[PDB]
Amino acid sequence: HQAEVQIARKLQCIADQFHRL
Amino acid sequence: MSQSNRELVVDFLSYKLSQKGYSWSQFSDSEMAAVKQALREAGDEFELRYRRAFSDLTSQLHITPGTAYQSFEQVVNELFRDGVNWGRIVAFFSFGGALCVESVDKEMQVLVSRIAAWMATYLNDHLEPWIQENGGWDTFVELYG
């Protein structure tokens, strides 16, 4: 029971694709 | 122990708070710090990209004083479970910043000092081993201007 992980994944989704500065 | 990550955290949070008109002073009592400038721009860009794909991070989670700590650690742990890169560290900073900004707007100023403390401890206990084994903080300034 966490919507916290969904936020963590949404964070990762932008973070992962953040190497293209 | 010269864990100056504290200064990095406070500097970033102060910037995010100053944007909304507040001051870090309200909530808490070798000069190559271009990382400060580099991290601010990076944080701004992250939040910009995040708010385009989804809603802005400030309205993602419903926070209460008693809910905050468990919610913070749960998010961060899941963010760093499958690996650590520079993008996720920016995610780490802008997330904590969004929490501070929200906690003030929802009038839970009590959390601001703690969010900084929570970030600082995790940045020392679980992230710095990755930092200098990937070239330290300057490497971030080089890769992200």
B50 vs A contacts (CB less than 8 Å):
10-11, 14
Range of the domain at B66: 1-145
**Alpha-carbon gap, residue B3 to B98, rounded angstroms:** 23
Rounded to 5°, the CA angle B133-B95-B83 comes to: 35
B interface test, pick of A6, A10, A12, A14 with most B CB neighbours within 10 Å:
A14
- How many domains are there within chain B? 1
* Token reading at B77: 């742990």
CB B63 within 8 A of CB B102: yes
A interface test, pick of B75, B127, B130, B134 with most A CB neighbours within 10 Å:
B75
**Alpha-carbon gap, residue B101 to B92, rounded angstroms:** 15
Q: How many CB pairs under 8 A join A and B?
A: 66
Instruction: Kindly report the length of chain A.
Output: 21
Residue B124 DSSP one-character state: I
What single string gives the DSSP state of each residue in chain B? ---THHHHHHHHHHHHHHHTT--GGGT-----TTHHHHHHHHHHHHHHHHHHHSS-GGGTS---TTTHHHHHHHHHHHHSTT---HHHHHHHHHHHHHHHHHHHHTT-THHHHHHHHHHHHHIIIIIHHHHGGGTTTHHHHHHT-
